[PDB]
Every structure is written in structure tokens, then in C-alpha cells.
Coordinates of C-alpha atoms in Angstrom, one line a residue:
Chain F
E1 CA 51.5 -50.8 34.1
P2 CA 49.4 -47.0 32.9
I3 CA 49.4 -49.1 29.4
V4 CA 46.6 -51.1 30.4
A5 CA 44.6 -48.2 32.2
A6 CA 45.1 -46.7 28.7
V7 CA 44.1 -49.6 26.7
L8 CA 41.0 -49.6 29.1
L9 CA 40.2 -45.8 28.5
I10 CA 40.4 -46.3 25.0
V11 CA 38.1 -49.2 24.9
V12 CA 35.6 -47.3 27.0
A13 CA 36.0 -43.9 24.8
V14 CA 35.1 -46.4 21.5
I15 CA 31.7 -47.4 23.6
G16 CA 30.6 -44.1 24.4
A17 CA 31.6 -43.3 20.7
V18 CA 29.1 -46.0 19.4
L19 CA 26.4 -45.0 22.0
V20 CA 26.7 -41.5 20.6
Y21 CA 26.4 -43.1 17.1
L22 CA 23.3 -45.1 18.0
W23 CA 21.4 -42.0 19.9
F24 CA 22.9 -39.4 17.0
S25 CA 21.3 -41.8 14.6
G26 CA 18.1 -42.0 15.9
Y27 CA 17.7 -38.4 16.5
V28 CA 18.5 -37.0 13.3
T29 CA 16.4 -39.4 11.8
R30 CA 13.2 -39.0 13.8
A31 CA 13.8 -35.0 13.8
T32 CA 14.8 -34.8 10.1
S33 CA 11.6 -36.3 9.1
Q34 CA 9.7 -34.5 11.6
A35 CA 10.7 -31.4 9.6
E36 CA 10.3 -32.6 6.4
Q37 CA 6.8 -33.8 7.2
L38 CA 6.0 -30.6 8.7
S39 CA 7.4 -28.6 5.5
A40 CA 4.4 -29.9 3.6
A41 CA 1.5 -27.0 3.0
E42 CA -2.3 -27.6 3.3
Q43 CA -4.5 -25.1 1.3
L44 CA -8.0 -24.7 1.5
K45 CA -10.7 -22.2 -0.6
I46 CA -14.5 -21.4 0.6
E47 CA -16.7 -21.2 -2.7
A48 CA -19.8 -19.7 -1.4
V49 CA -22.2 -19.0 1.4
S50 CA -25.7 -18.8 2.4
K51 CA -27.4 -17.5 5.0
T52 CA -31.1 -18.8 6.3
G53 CA -32.6 -16.8 9.0
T54 CA -29.7 -16.6 11.6
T55 CA -27.7 -19.8 10.4
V56 CA -24.9 -19.5 8.3
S57 CA -24.0 -22.2 5.8
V58 CA -20.8 -22.1 4.0
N59 CA -19.3 -24.8 1.5
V60 CA -15.5 -25.5 1.8
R61 CA -13.4 -26.4 -1.2
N62 CA -10.5 -29.2 -0.6
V63 CA -8.0 -28.2 -3.1
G64 CA -5.3 -29.8 -1.5
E65 CA -4.0 -33.4 -1.9
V66 CA -4.4 -34.5 1.7
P67 CA -7.5 -35.0 4.0
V68 CA -8.4 -31.7 5.8
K69 CA -10.5 -31.2 9.5
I70 CA -12.5 -28.0 10.2
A71 CA -12.8 -27.4 13.8
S72 CA -14.1 -23.7 14.1
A73 CA -15.7 -21.1 12.1
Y74 CA -16.3 -17.2 13.4
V75 CA -18.3 -14.1 11.9
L76 CA -15.6 -11.5 12.2
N77 CA -16.2 -7.7 11.9
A78 CA -14.9 -5.7 9.4
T79 CA -11.5 -3.6 10.1
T80 CA -11.7 -4.7 14.0
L81 CA -10.5 -8.1 14.4
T82 CA -13.7 -8.6 16.9
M83 CA -16.0 -12.1 16.5
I84 CA -19.6 -11.6 17.0
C85 CA -20.4 -15.3 16.9
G86 CA -18.2 -18.5 16.5
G87 CA -16.8 -21.1 18.6
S88 CA -15.9 -25.1 18.8
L89 CA -18.0 -27.0 16.3
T90 CA -19.9 -29.7 18.0
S91 CA -18.0 -32.5 15.8
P92 CA -15.1 -31.7 13.6
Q93 CA -15.7 -32.4 9.8
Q94 CA -13.6 -34.3 7.4
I95 CA -13.3 -33.4 4.0
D96 CA -11.4 -35.4 1.4
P97 CA -9.4 -33.9 -1.3
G98 CA -11.5 -33.1 -4.5
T99 CA -14.5 -33.1 -2.6
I100 CA -16.9 -30.2 -0.8
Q101 CA -18.6 -30.1 2.6
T102 CA -21.0 -28.2 4.0
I103 CA -20.3 -25.9 7.4
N104 CA -22.5 -24.4 9.9
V105 CA -21.5 -21.5 12.3
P106 CA -21.6 -22.6 15.8
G107 CA -24.4 -21.0 17.5
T108 CA -27.0 -18.4 16.8
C109 CA -25.8 -14.7 16.2
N110 CA -28.1 -12.0 14.4
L111 CA -27.0 -9.8 11.3
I112 CA -27.4 -6.6 9.2
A113 CA -28.5 -6.3 6.0
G114 CA -26.3 -4.7 4.2
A115 CA -23.5 -4.8 6.2
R116 CA -19.8 -6.0 6.4
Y117 CA -18.6 -9.6 7.6
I118 CA -15.9 -11.6 6.7
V119 CA -16.7 -15.4 7.4
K120 CA -13.4 -17.3 8.4
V121 CA -13.1 -21.2 8.8
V122 CA -9.9 -22.8 10.7
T123 CA -8.4 -26.4 10.3
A124 CA -7.1 -28.3 12.9
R125 CA -3.6 -27.8 11.7
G126 CA -4.4 -24.3 11.7
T127 CA -4.7 -23.4 8.1
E128 CA -7.2 -19.9 7.6
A129 CA -9.2 -19.3 4.9
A130 CA -11.8 -16.6 4.8
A131 CA -13.9 -14.3 2.2
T132 CA -16.4 -11.7 2.3
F133 CA -20.3 -11.4 1.7
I134 CA -23.0 -9.1 2.1
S135 CA -25.9 -10.2 4.4
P136 CA -29.2 -10.0 2.9
Chain S
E1 CA 44.3 -42.0 24.1
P2 CA 42.0 -39.1 23.2
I3 CA 43.3 -39.3 20.1
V4 CA 41.3 -42.4 19.0
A5 CA 38.3 -41.2 20.7
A6 CA 38.7 -37.6 18.4
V7 CA 39.1 -40.3 15.3
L8 CA 35.6 -42.2 16.3
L9 CA 34.2 -38.3 16.7
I10 CA 35.1 -37.2 13.3
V11 CA 33.8 -40.7 11.8
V12 CA 30.6 -40.1 13.7
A13 CA 30.1 -36.6 12.2
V14 CA 31.5 -37.8 8.7
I15 CA 28.4 -40.3 8.6
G16 CA 25.8 -37.9 9.9
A17 CA 26.8 -35.4 7.5
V18 CA 26.2 -38.2 4.8
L19 CA 22.8 -39.0 6.1
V20 CA 22.1 -35.2 6.3
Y21 CA 22.9 -34.8 2.7
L22 CA 21.1 -38.0 1.5
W23 CA 18.0 -36.8 3.2
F24 CA 18.7 -32.8 2.1
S25 CA 18.8 -34.0 -1.8
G26 CA 15.9 -36.1 -1.2
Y27 CA 13.6 -33.1 0.3
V28 CA 14.9 -30.7 -1.9
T29 CA 13.9 -32.8 -4.9
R30 CA 10.3 -33.3 -4.1
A31 CA 9.8 -29.7 -2.8
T32 CA 11.3 -28.0 -6.2
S33 CA 9.0 -30.2 -8.2
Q34 CA 6.1 -30.0 -6.0
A35 CA 6.6 -26.2 -6.8
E36 CA 7.4 -26.0 -10.1
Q37 CA 4.7 -28.7 -11.1
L38 CA 1.8 -26.5 -8.6
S39 CA 3.1 -23.5 -10.5
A40 CA 1.0 -24.7 -13.6
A41 CA -2.2 -22.4 -13.6
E42 CA -5.8 -23.5 -15.7
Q43 CA -8.2 -20.9 -17.3
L44 CA -11.8 -21.7 -18.3
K45 CA -14.3 -20.2 -20.0
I46 CA -17.9 -20.3 -20.9
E47 CA -19.3 -19.9 -24.2
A48 CA -23.1 -19.6 -23.4
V49 CA -25.7 -20.8 -21.2
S50 CA -29.3 -22.0 -22.0
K51 CA -32.2 -22.4 -19.9
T52 CA -34.8 -24.9 -20.6
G53 CA -37.8 -24.8 -18.1
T54 CA -36.2 -24.8 -14.6
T55 CA -33.1 -26.4 -15.6
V56 CA -29.6 -24.1 -16.3
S57 CA -27.3 -25.8 -19.2
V58 CA -23.9 -24.5 -19.6
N59 CA -21.2 -24.9 -22.0
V60 CA -17.9 -24.9 -20.9
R61 CA -14.8 -24.7 -23.0
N62 CA -11.3 -25.4 -21.7
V63 CA -8.7 -23.4 -23.3
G64 CA -6.0 -24.9 -21.1
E65 CA -3.8 -27.8 -22.3
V66 CA -4.5 -30.3 -19.6
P67 CA -7.6 -31.9 -18.5
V68 CA -9.8 -30.4 -15.8
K69 CA -12.6 -31.7 -14.1
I70 CA -15.8 -29.6 -13.2
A71 CA -17.1 -30.1 -9.2
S72 CA -19.5 -27.9 -8.7
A73 CA -22.0 -25.0 -10.4
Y74 CA -23.7 -22.1 -8.6
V75 CA -26.3 -19.2 -9.6
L76 CA -25.4 -16.5 -7.8
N77 CA -27.4 -13.4 -6.7
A78 CA -26.2 -10.3 -7.9
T79 CA -24.3 -7.9 -5.2
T80 CA -25.1 -10.4 -2.5
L81 CA -22.7 -13.2 -3.1
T82 CA -25.4 -15.4 -1.9
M83 CA -26.1 -18.4 -3.6
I84 CA -29.6 -20.0 -4.5
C85 CA -29.2 -23.0 -5.9
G86 CA -26.0 -24.9 -6.7
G87 CA -23.8 -27.9 -5.2
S88 CA -21.9 -31.0 -5.7
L89 CA -22.2 -32.5 -9.3
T90 CA -23.5 -35.9 -9.1
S91 CA -20.6 -37.1 -10.9
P92 CA -17.5 -35.2 -12.1
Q93 CA -17.4 -34.5 -15.6
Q94 CA -13.6 -34.4 -17.3
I95 CA -13.2 -31.9 -20.1
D96 CA -10.9 -32.5 -23.1
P97 CA -8.7 -29.6 -23.8
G98 CA -9.6 -28.2 -27.2
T99 CA -13.1 -29.7 -26.5
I100 CA -16.7 -28.2 -24.9
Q101 CA -18.6 -30.1 -22.4
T102 CA -22.6 -29.3 -21.3
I103 CA -23.1 -28.9 -17.4
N104 CA -26.3 -28.6 -15.8
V105 CA -26.7 -26.9 -12.3
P106 CA -27.6 -29.4 -10.1
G107 CA -30.9 -29.4 -8.4
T108 CA -33.9 -27.5 -9.6
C109 CA -34.2 -23.8 -8.6
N110 CA -37.0 -21.3 -9.9
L111 CA -35.8 -17.7 -12.0
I112 CA -37.4 -14.7 -12.5
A113 CA -37.2 -13.3 -16.1
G114 CA -35.4 -9.9 -16.2
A115 CA -33.5 -10.7 -12.9
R116 CA -29.9 -10.5 -12.6
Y117 CA -27.9 -14.1 -12.0
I118 CA -24.5 -15.4 -12.1
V119 CA -23.5 -18.5 -13.4
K120 CA -20.5 -19.8 -11.5
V121 CA -18.3 -23.1 -12.2
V122 CA -15.2 -24.3 -10.2
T123 CA -13.0 -27.3 -11.1
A124 CA -11.9 -29.5 -8.6
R125 CA -8.4 -28.2 -8.4
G126 CA -10.2 -24.7 -7.8
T127 CA -10.0 -22.6 -11.0
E128 CA -12.9 -20.2 -10.8
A129 CA -14.6 -18.9 -14.2
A130 CA -18.2 -17.0 -14.2
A131 CA -20.3 -14.3 -16.2
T132 CA -23.9 -13.0 -16.2
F133 CA -27.1 -13.7 -18.4
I134 CA -30.0 -12.4 -18.4
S135 CA -33.0 -14.8 -17.4
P136 CA -35.9 -15.4 -20.1
Chain R
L1 CA 16.2 -54.0 -11.2
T2 CA 16.8 -57.1 -12.5
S3 CA 20.4 -55.7 -12.9
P4 CA 22.0 -52.5 -12.1
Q5 CA 23.0 -50.5 -14.3
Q6 CA 26.0 -48.5 -14.2
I7 CA 26.3 -44.8 -15.5
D8 CA 29.3 -43.3 -16.6
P9 CA 30.6 -39.7 -15.8
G10 CA 29.3 -37.3 -18.2
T11 CA 26.6 -39.8 -20.3
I12 CA 23.3 -40.8 -19.7
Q13 CA 21.4 -43.8 -19.2
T14 CA 17.7 -45.4 -19.6
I15 CA 16.3 -46.5 -16.8
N16 CA 12.6 -48.6 -16.9
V17 CA 10.5 -48.9 -13.4
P18 CA 10.1 -52.5 -12.4
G19 CA 7.1 -54.0 -13.2
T20 CA 4.1 -52.8 -14.4
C21 CA 1.8 -50.1 -12.6
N22 CA -1.2 -48.4 -14.0
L23 CA -1.8 -44.9 -13.8
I24 CA -4.6 -41.8 -14.0
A25 CA -4.3 -39.3 -16.7
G26 CA -3.9 -36.2 -15.3
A27 CA -3.0 -37.0 -11.9
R28 CA 0.2 -36.6 -9.7
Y29 CA 2.7 -39.2 -9.5
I30 CA 6.7 -38.6 -8.1
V31 CA 9.3 -40.8 -9.8
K32 CA 12.3 -41.5 -7.9
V33 CA 15.8 -43.3 -8.5
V34 CA 18.1 -44.3 -5.7
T35 CA 22.0 -45.3 -6.7
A36 CA 23.7 -48.1 -5.0
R37 CA 25.4 -46.0 -2.7
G38 CA 22.2 -44.4 -1.6
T39 CA 22.1 -41.2 -3.4
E40 CA 18.2 -39.7 -4.1
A41 CA 17.0 -37.9 -6.9
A42 CA 13.8 -37.6 -8.4
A43 CA 11.0 -35.2 -10.0
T44 CA 7.2 -35.0 -10.8
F45 CA 5.3 -35.2 -14.2
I46 CA 2.2 -35.3 -15.4
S47 CA 0.8 -38.6 -16.5
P48 CA -0.7 -38.6 -20.1
Chain K
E1 CA 47.5 -43.0 36.7
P2 CA 46.0 -41.5 33.2
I3 CA 42.6 -42.0 34.7
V4 CA 43.0 -38.8 37.7
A5 CA 44.3 -36.8 34.7
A6 CA 41.1 -37.8 32.2
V7 CA 39.4 -37.2 35.3
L8 CA 40.6 -33.7 35.7
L9 CA 40.4 -32.8 31.8
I10 CA 36.7 -34.0 31.9
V11 CA 36.0 -31.6 34.5
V12 CA 38.0 -28.9 33.0
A13 CA 36.0 -28.9 29.7
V14 CA 32.8 -29.1 31.6
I15 CA 33.8 -25.5 33.1
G16 CA 34.6 -24.6 30.1
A17 CA 31.6 -25.3 28.5
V18 CA 29.4 -23.8 31.2
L19 CA 31.2 -20.5 30.6
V20 CA 30.7 -20.8 27.2
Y21 CA 27.1 -21.4 27.4
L22 CA 26.7 -18.4 30.3
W23 CA 28.8 -15.8 27.1
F24 CA 26.5 -17.4 24.9
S25 CA 23.4 -16.8 26.4
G26 CA 24.4 -13.3 27.1
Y27 CA 25.4 -12.5 23.5
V28 CA 22.8 -14.1 21.6
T29 CA 20.3 -12.1 24.2
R30 CA 21.7 -8.9 23.8
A31 CA 22.5 -9.1 19.9
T32 CA 18.9 -10.7 19.5
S33 CA 17.1 -7.8 21.0
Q34 CA 19.4 -5.4 19.5
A35 CA 18.8 -6.6 16.0
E36 CA 14.8 -6.8 17.1
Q37 CA 14.5 -3.5 18.1
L38 CA 16.4 -2.0 15.4
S39 CA 14.4 -3.7 13.2
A40 CA 11.5 -1.3 13.9
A41 CA 11.0 1.4 10.8
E42 CA 9.9 5.2 11.1
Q43 CA 7.7 7.1 8.8
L44 CA 7.2 10.7 8.4
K45 CA 5.1 13.1 6.2
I46 CA 5.4 16.6 5.5
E47 CA 2.2 18.6 5.4
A48 CA 2.9 22.0 3.8
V49 CA 5.7 24.7 3.1
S50 CA 5.6 28.3 3.6
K51 CA 8.4 31.0 2.3
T52 CA 8.2 34.7 4.6
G53 CA 11.0 36.8 2.8
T54 CA 14.1 34.3 2.5
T55 CA 13.2 31.9 5.5
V56 CA 11.6 28.5 4.8
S57 CA 9.1 27.2 7.0
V58 CA 8.2 23.5 7.0
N59 CA 5.5 21.4 9.3
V60 CA 6.6 17.9 10.1
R61 CA 3.7 15.5 11.4
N62 CA 4.8 12.4 12.5
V63 CA 2.1 9.6 11.5
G64 CA 4.4 7.2 13.4
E65 CA 3.6 6.0 16.9
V66 CA 7.5 6.8 18.3
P67 CA 9.5 9.7 19.5
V68 CA 10.7 11.9 16.6
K69 CA 13.7 14.2 16.8
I70 CA 14.3 16.6 13.7
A71 CA 17.8 17.4 13.0
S72 CA 18.5 18.9 9.6
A73 CA 16.8 20.5 6.6
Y74 CA 17.8 21.3 2.9
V75 CA 16.3 22.9 -0.2
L76 CA 17.8 20.5 -3.1
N77 CA 18.2 22.3 -6.6
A78 CA 16.2 19.6 -9.4
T79 CA 17.4 16.5 -10.6
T80 CA 20.9 17.6 -9.7
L81 CA 21.4 16.5 -6.0
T82 CA 23.3 19.9 -5.1
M83 CA 22.4 21.7 -1.9
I84 CA 21.9 25.4 -1.6
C85 CA 21.2 26.0 1.6
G86 CA 21.2 24.0 4.9
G87 CA 22.8 22.4 7.4
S88 CA 22.5 21.6 11.6
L89 CA 19.6 23.0 13.5
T90 CA 20.9 24.8 16.1
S91 CA 18.9 22.7 18.4
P92 CA 17.1 19.4 17.5
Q93 CA 13.0 19.9 17.7
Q94 CA 11.3 16.7 19.1
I95 CA 8.0 16.3 17.4
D96 CA 5.6 14.1 19.4
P97 CA 3.7 11.1 17.9
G98 CA 0.4 12.5 16.0
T99 CA 1.7 16.6 16.7
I100 CA 2.9 18.6 14.4
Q101 CA 5.9 21.5 14.8
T102 CA 7.6 24.3 12.9
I103 CA 11.1 23.6 11.5
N104 CA 13.1 26.7 9.8
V105 CA 15.9 26.0 6.9
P106 CA 19.2 27.1 8.8
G107 CA 20.7 30.2 7.8
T108 CA 19.4 32.4 5.0
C109 CA 19.3 31.2 1.1
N110 CA 17.6 33.3 -1.8
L111 CA 15.1 31.8 -4.2
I112 CA 13.9 32.6 -7.8
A113 CA 10.0 32.3 -8.2
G114 CA 8.6 29.8 -10.4
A115 CA 11.5 27.7 -10.4
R116 CA 11.9 23.8 -8.9
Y117 CA 13.1 23.1 -5.5
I118 CA 12.7 20.1 -3.2
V119 CA 12.6 20.7 0.5
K120 CA 14.0 17.6 2.9
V121 CA 13.7 16.8 6.4
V122 CA 15.7 14.4 8.2
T123 CA 15.8 12.4 11.5
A124 CA 18.1 11.9 14.0
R125 CA 17.7 8.3 13.3
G126 CA 18.4 8.8 9.4
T127 CA 14.5 8.7 8.3
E128 CA 14.2 11.0 5.2
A129 CA 10.9 12.6 3.8
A130 CA 10.7 15.2 1.1
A131 CA 8.6 17.0 -1.1
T132 CA 8.6 19.5 -3.7
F133 CA 7.3 23.2 -4.0
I134 CA 7.2 26.5 -6.6
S135 CA 8.8 29.4 -4.5
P136 CA 6.4 32.5 -4.9
Chain A
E1 CA 50.6 -38.0 29.7
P2 CA 46.7 -37.6 28.1
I3 CA 47.8 -33.7 28.6
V4 CA 50.1 -33.9 26.3
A5 CA 48.1 -35.4 23.7
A6 CA 45.1 -32.8 23.9
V7 CA 47.6 -30.0 23.8
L8 CA 48.7 -31.3 20.4
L9 CA 45.1 -31.5 19.7
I10 CA 44.5 -28.4 20.2
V11 CA 47.4 -27.0 18.6
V12 CA 46.5 -29.0 15.7
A13 CA 42.9 -27.6 15.7
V14 CA 44.1 -24.4 15.7
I15 CA 46.0 -24.8 12.9
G16 CA 43.3 -26.2 11.2
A17 CA 41.1 -23.3 11.8
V18 CA 43.8 -20.7 10.2
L19 CA 43.7 -23.0 7.3
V20 CA 40.1 -22.8 6.9
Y21 CA 39.8 -19.0 7.9
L22 CA 42.1 -18.3 4.8
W23 CA 40.3 -20.4 2.3
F24 CA 37.1 -18.6 3.6
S25 CA 38.6 -15.4 3.5
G26 CA 39.7 -15.7 0.0
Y27 CA 36.6 -17.6 -1.4
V28 CA 34.1 -14.9 0.2
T29 CA 35.8 -12.1 -1.1
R30 CA 36.5 -13.6 -4.9
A31 CA 32.9 -15.3 -5.5
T32 CA 31.4 -12.1 -3.8
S33 CA 33.3 -9.6 -6.4
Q34 CA 32.5 -12.3 -9.1
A35 CA 28.6 -12.3 -8.1
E36 CA 28.6 -8.4 -8.0
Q37 CA 30.4 -7.7 -11.2
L38 CA 28.0 -10.0 -12.9
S39 CA 24.9 -8.1 -11.1
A40 CA 25.9 -5.1 -13.6
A41 CA 23.5 -4.5 -16.4
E42 CA 23.8 -4.0 -19.9
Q43 CA 21.3 -1.9 -22.2
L44 CA 21.2 -1.1 -25.9
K45 CA 18.5 0.5 -28.5
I46 CA 18.8 0.3 -32.1
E47 CA 17.8 3.6 -34.1
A48 CA 17.3 2.6 -37.5
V49 CA 17.5 0.0 -40.3
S50 CA 18.1 0.2 -44.2
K51 CA 17.7 -2.5 -46.9
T52 CA 20.1 -1.9 -49.9
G53 CA 18.9 -4.9 -52.4
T54 CA 19.3 -7.8 -50.2
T55 CA 21.4 -6.8 -47.4
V56 CA 20.2 -5.6 -44.2
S57 CA 22.1 -2.8 -42.3
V58 CA 21.1 -1.7 -38.8
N59 CA 22.5 0.9 -36.5
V60 CA 22.9 0.2 -33.1
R61 CA 23.5 2.8 -30.4
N62 CA 25.1 1.9 -27.2
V63 CA 22.7 3.8 -24.3
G64 CA 25.2 2.1 -21.3
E65 CA 28.1 3.0 -20.0
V66 CA 30.6 0.1 -20.9
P67 CA 31.9 -1.4 -24.2
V68 CA 29.9 -3.9 -25.9
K69 CA 30.6 -6.4 -28.7
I70 CA 27.9 -7.2 -31.1
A71 CA 28.3 -10.6 -32.2
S72 CA 25.3 -11.8 -34.1
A73 CA 22.2 -11.0 -35.8
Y74 CA 18.9 -12.6 -37.1
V75 CA 15.8 -11.8 -39.1
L76 CA 13.0 -13.8 -37.3
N77 CA 9.2 -14.3 -39.1
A78 CA 6.5 -13.2 -37.2
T79 CA 4.9 -15.4 -34.5
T80 CA 6.8 -18.6 -35.0
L81 CA 10.4 -17.4 -33.8
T82 CA 12.0 -18.6 -36.9
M83 CA 15.2 -17.6 -38.3
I84 CA 15.2 -17.0 -41.9
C85 CA 18.9 -15.4 -42.3
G86 CA 21.6 -14.9 -39.9
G87 CA 24.6 -16.4 -38.0
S88 CA 27.8 -15.7 -36.3
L89 CA 29.3 -12.2 -37.9
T90 CA 32.7 -12.7 -39.5
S91 CA 34.2 -10.4 -36.9
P92 CA 32.5 -9.4 -33.7
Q93 CA 32.0 -5.3 -33.8
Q94 CA 32.7 -3.4 -30.7
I95 CA 30.4 -0.6 -29.8
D96 CA 31.9 2.4 -27.3
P97 CA 29.4 4.1 -25.0
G98 CA 27.9 6.9 -26.2
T99 CA 28.5 6.4 -29.9
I100 CA 27.3 4.8 -32.9
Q101 CA 28.1 1.7 -35.1
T102 CA 26.7 0.0 -38.6
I103 CA 25.9 -3.8 -38.6
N104 CA 24.9 -5.9 -41.5
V105 CA 23.0 -9.0 -40.8
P106 CA 25.4 -11.9 -41.9
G107 CA 24.8 -13.9 -45.6
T108 CA 22.0 -12.9 -47.9
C109 CA 18.7 -13.4 -47.5
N110 CA 15.7 -12.2 -49.9
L111 CA 12.7 -10.5 -48.5
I112 CA 9.2 -9.8 -49.5
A113 CA 7.7 -6.5 -50.0
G114 CA 5.4 -5.4 -47.5
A115 CA 5.9 -8.5 -45.2
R116 CA 6.3 -8.7 -41.3
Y117 CA 9.9 -9.2 -40.1
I118 CA 11.6 -9.1 -36.5
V119 CA 15.5 -7.8 -37.0
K120 CA 17.2 -8.8 -33.8
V121 CA 21.0 -8.3 -32.5
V122 CA 22.7 -10.0 -29.7
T123 CA 25.4 -9.0 -27.6
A124 CA 28.8 -11.1 -26.3
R125 CA 27.3 -11.2 -23.2
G126 CA 23.6 -12.0 -24.1
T127 CA 21.9 -8.7 -23.7
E128 CA 18.8 -8.4 -26.3
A129 CA 17.7 -5.7 -28.3
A130 CA 15.2 -5.8 -31.5
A131 CA 12.9 -4.0 -33.1
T132 CA 10.5 -4.0 -36.6
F133 CA 10.5 -2.7 -39.7
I134 CA 8.3 -2.7 -43.3
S135 CA 10.0 -4.5 -46.3
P136 CA 10.1 -2.2 -49.0

């Protein structure tokens, strides 16, 4: 009589094992592939900068193999990591691999000739690229 | 009765380990190969420059072993890192290793005789080569 | 593949990618081979 | 009848898992935070030394930002790593960040003019800072 | 009734864990020690070379502290890494620490007066030491 209960319990345990199998396969596949794709890296470099009046224009070179979106740009003060001007771009700019694009710092901020300034661009994914220039 | 459940759990763990091994092999191969192939570097050198009116012509020799494409050229001002003329070329030019090619700066920019100007050429992959010249 | 190719332990074999595909010189490509059991091995090369 | 035993065993397993969770949270917390706090590093530098008779006085400045206790001082012979005089200070001296204090080598040791000697001071935590001087 | 099966399963798991611990201790110890001992370094230096007729004699000094065996010697051509003469020695020669030994390049190879050559000696473990000479 307990044998019947044991058989039912074994069947229930097998069903639970199958359900664990299904969920575990789904989770391992999804999370594993998500981690694998986040393992990929994104690289940028800025070729040169130009200043016209009070507007700063930057040319960004996409040396990577994936499309790049530029979302913000700043003008950082030297050795203090404090921004003078910057913010969200009005519309994100897409940069194709092997191509170039022109980026303008949002807003208007004055500059002092012969002073230290760091121009910085950040991607939508978080990649950071920056360099220095001497304001005319 | 728990023995059957334990056997199913062991089987599930073994299958999960097999799937993890498959993905791990694929990912390690892809990542290792990408890193090894991007470890390679490219070198460029400019032989000489010439100016005809307001057009700048640059001869680039690729001392590397694999083809490299020229993407943009600039004429940089001294000690200020500010561009005067330049931008993306109309069509990229491919340079065969062991050969030479002539590149013209895009657009038209005036120059002042006896002044400092830095000629700069950037590859599609991001390699930079540059030098200086005296404007006639 | 038209017919599966068997590779003995400690030996080597030649495998041709099925079909015909054009390539671009100096471009990036990943070559990949998969076993009957599912094992994956791959690498990259620069097309001539 | 085995169903009741199975339910009790499941309850026992759940209670054991809860206990394991409690201990695991506690142990991870303490060990992790201990590792984080011992990860911090300490830096020292000695400004100048002076000799009065047979007493060696050293001024130590903590370029770091954490409180520091000086525990011992030595006078090491050149390239043989053998001490001539040194030992525990009578009472450890606390040197505040951004300040300096005077430390005297314990005991009395003679010196030879124009010879090589390395003065060495060690913190209570084990940080090592030293330099060389020529005895007058 | 499932309680007995659970107790037996726990006992089996404990035995398996003991076996895993035994193997793990053995493996970590022996593999770790083999790695530590291969971490050791081997250093050679050659004092001078001599030419008698068509035979090249090299004096090798053991600047290290461990016994070293010399197995082969070569004569490389300049800038091409191509051997002119060389091969396995008839019997490997042992060099004691702090001592010197004379090694003759195997075989007979002609040389040209005033020509460029590299003499090279390799140890049993793979250490490489070499220098240059001008043939008389």
C-alpha cells in the first residue's frame, strides 16, 4: 500500500526534475548569451577639435566595428574634474564604423585663450574618449 | 524514492555542464582570436608634401604588411591643436604595402608663407602619422 | 557538409567551407567548425 | 505514509537552507568588508635626518591621509642587511596625517664618518620607508 | 522509509567529498610545487671564444647557482638566423656553479676572415646565451 504512494512520489519528483530542466536550460542560455554579448567592447577616438566663436566642434572617428551613438559632450577643467559647459545633445548622433561625424558641445560656454581644457565625449553604451587642446 | 530524484538532478547538472562547456569553448575561441588579431599594429610614414596654389598634396608610403585605407587629412596649426582645413575624403584610398599613394587635403584652405603647419593623415583603423612643413 | 568527415585522434584533416562566398581583402572574418556532438572551435584570419 | 515523512524532510531542508543563508550572509559580509578595509595602502616618506653625538633623529611626514604609529627604527649596514643598532621604541609615536614628528633610534650606536648607513622606520601596520645618509 | 534513503545518500555524499578532498590536496600540492620549481631562473654568460684552424672553442661561465648542462652550439649568419654549422654534441657537458668549461662547436665548418658570425650555446632546459666575434 505504501508502494503506490512511493510510485506517485517518484513520478512527482521526475516531473519536478523535468520542470527544473526546462527552466535551467532557458536561464543558462539567456544569461550566458547576455554575458557573452556584454563581453564585447566599444572603442572610440577623437581626431581633432575646432573652436568657432563660442561653439566647439569635435570630429569623432569610429575605429570599432559596431555602430556608435554619441549622447553627451563636456568641457572639463584641468585637474579638478569640474564641468564648465555640457549636457544632453538635442538628438543622439549615430556614427557608422569606418566613418566620421561632427559633434557640437551643447549650449554656449566661454573660453580663455591659452588655458587648459579637456574635451570629452561619451557613448550611449558608456564608452569614454577624451583629449586636450589649447583654446585660441 | 529520493534516489530517483537525485539521479535526475545529477543528469540535469551533467547536461548543464555540457552546455556551459560548449558555450565556453565558443566564446574563448572568439575572444582569444579577436584579441590576437587586434594585437597587430600598423605604421605609416609620409615621404614629402607639395603645394599647388591652395591644394596640398601628400605622398604616403605604407611600410606595413597589410593594406591600409586613408580616411581623412588635416592641416593643423602649431601648438594649438586646432584644424584650419580638412575632413572626410570623398572616397577612401587604399594603399598597397610596398607602394606609395598621393592624397589631397579635402576642400580649399589658404596658407601663409613661412608659417608653421602640421599635415596629418589618419587611417580607417585609427593609425596616425604626421609631420611638419614650411609653406612657400 | 555534403558528407561528414571523420577525424581520427592524433591526426589531421582538411575541411572546405560549403558553397562559394566572396570575400574582401583586409576584412575581418571568423572561421568556425562544429562537430557532430556539438563541440565548437574557431579562429580568425585576414583574407588576402 | 511516506508522504508525511517526505513533507517533514522538505520542511527540515528548508530550515537548513534558511540557516545556511543566515550564516552565508554574515560571513560574506565580514570577510568581504575585512578584505576591502585591508586593501587600503599606507605611504610614508622621511624628510631629513640629523646626528647629535651618538643619537640619530629622523623626521617622518605622512603624505597619506590615515593615522600612523611609528614602532621601530634601525640603522642598516650597506648591502648586507645586517642591523647595527635598533629595536622597539619605548612608546609608539602617533604621527597625524599632514604633520611631522621626531623619531630617535632606540639605544646608542657609534658611527664612522664618511661611511654608508641606511636609516629605516617601520609602521605598526608594517609599512616600510627608508633612505640613506652620510654620517658626519 | 525515505529517511533511511536520505541518510544513506548523505553518507555517500560525505564519502565522495572526502575522496574529492584527498585528490584536491594531492593535486594542488604537486601541481603547485611543480609550477613553483619551474618558476626558477637560469642564467649563463660566455667569456671569450677562440678559433683553431676550423674548430671553434667557446668558454662558458656559470653565473648561476645550479648545475647546467650544455647540449648544442651553433654559428648563425647575420640578419638571417640561418645556421652554418652546429648540432647535437656527442655527449652533453655539465658546468658546475661558479666554474668554467670549454665547449667546441660540433662538426667542422669553414669561416671567412673578417666576416660576421654569431656564436650561440643552448642549455638542456632551453636557456639561451650568445655573443659575437670577428673571424681571424
